[PDB]
Subunit: 114 residues, 3 copies
């Protein structure tokens, strides 16, 4: 699993330990071992959501499996919860794109997960 968040919230407002918290919570939620969970946070972005420049985030979660209707609802509650608590972003100003990747379409370690 890889989780990326793009946000217009400034760098200074991202708290120490945010990447590790994202890692642990995602390991928990997705089942997958934390050793292979990747996370990318991108602050200070030039964005608008609904035409407004109030705090917002555009995110993506890529996973080999563990993507589905019920699971995705659960991930969003988790991730929106984190973004609201740690970055003060309203959950209704967050979009998260979910990608169910084929193992053959994910490269890692000079090869793929196929």
């Amino acid at each position: 699993p890889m989780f990326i968040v793009n946000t217009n919230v400034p760098r200074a407002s991202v708290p120490d330990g945010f990447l590790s918290e994202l890692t642990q919570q995602l390991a928990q939620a997705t089942g997958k071992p934390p050793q292979y969970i990747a996370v990318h946070v991108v602050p200070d972005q030039l964005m608008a959501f609904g035409g407004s420049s109030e705090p917002c985030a555009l995110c993506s979660l890529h996973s080999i499996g563990k993507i589905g209707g019920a699971q995705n609802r659960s991930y969003s509650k988790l991730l929106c919860g984190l973004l609201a608590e740690r970055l003060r972003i309203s959950p209704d100003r967050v979009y998260i794109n979910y990608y169910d990747m084929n193992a053959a379409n994910v490269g890692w370690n000079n090869s793929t997960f196929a």
Copy 2:
């Protein structure tokens, strides 16, 4: 709908109001309310297009439906049009990836659009 533009054009060359213009025009093009539209512009990128570092752009448009052969041609004309006029990027140095998303795979407001 969410639209992301990555470009090697400098921040100073992004005109005031560009994010609002993208929002308004995407609302018109997709027929969705501007309130749902998210836009993200990323200037000053380290990019090459065809081995050249003249102005270029790599973009994506994520939508739940409203994606298709004819509609995407219409989006490209519109968005290339804006990138040329506002950022002075030649349309033939623009790639736009279109994603037709399932509602179940778009998180928002602690849930999904399903």
Copy 3:
């Protein structure tokens, strides 16, 4: 083909000609003319892999065709190799997302590739 690299490796650690080298290698590897190849490198990123902030990379390769099990393995060896040699990133801290797009879902020059 579009190739994007996101990495926590510093900018100054990205060698001159890395974009050019990416372009030629990708041209050779995909059989596509260098004129069609786009490359995007994003250094200095706030990222973690396996909870660790040691050098790592999150990448994607978008192409119309030329994507599949065997092909993606060869790409992964090629690109991890280039990341290891040029950016000193361990192959086992690299993810590459492969996207096989329909020509109709790639915008370019006021239209699509369809």
